[PDB]
Symmetry: C2
Subunit: 97 residues, 2 copies
């Protein structure tokens, strides 16, 4: 006997889409704040690793958010002002793997 | 002489404003993690302890943490997502976390 996608099924799929957008936005927000603080450290790398697991962020999406933040001129300016010119080695290594 | 007679304001720092944007970023970062975790379902010890590591790194006080929890547990949209994702018991542990410690 057949079955098919109901409105509830499509509703649950849409909730998953909304959740995934919230999760990626959350993770990107943490990367942005950490990048603006200065360079990446091992402790922050570890913390990001746990956050990516709990927010279901793939390594591909992680690396792309690291690069986005390293390259964002506003965040780079904040790091320059707050921490000084050394601010992105280590983030850039992480964004390469 | 060595120094410019027409100083290009390009060179100037904006330390006060950057300090404020950094703080805005930190608070927005923590709030967004609370909101996403709340939309997943109820709080777990693993989420609580991870939020504790995040609050250290983002300089978030325990008062601000609990206020974010109370906000998120009561957000109608985040709660609708959690009920659809995780079922009807998606709030009690969050509400405990929002209330205790004073």
């Amino acid at each position: 006997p057949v079955v098919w996608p109901t409105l509830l099924d499509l509703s649950r799929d849409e909730c998953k889409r909304i959740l995934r957008k919230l999760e990626l936005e959350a993770y990107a927000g943490v990367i942005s704040a950490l990048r603006a603080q200065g360079d990446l450290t091992k402790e922050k790398k570890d913390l990001l690793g746990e956050l990516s697991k709990v927010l279901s962020i793939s390594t591909e999406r992680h690396r792309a958010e690291v690069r986005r933040a390293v390259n964002d001129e506003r965040l780079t300016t904040i790091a320059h002002n707050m921490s000084g010119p050394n601010s992105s080695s280590e983030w850039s290594i992480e964004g390469r793997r």
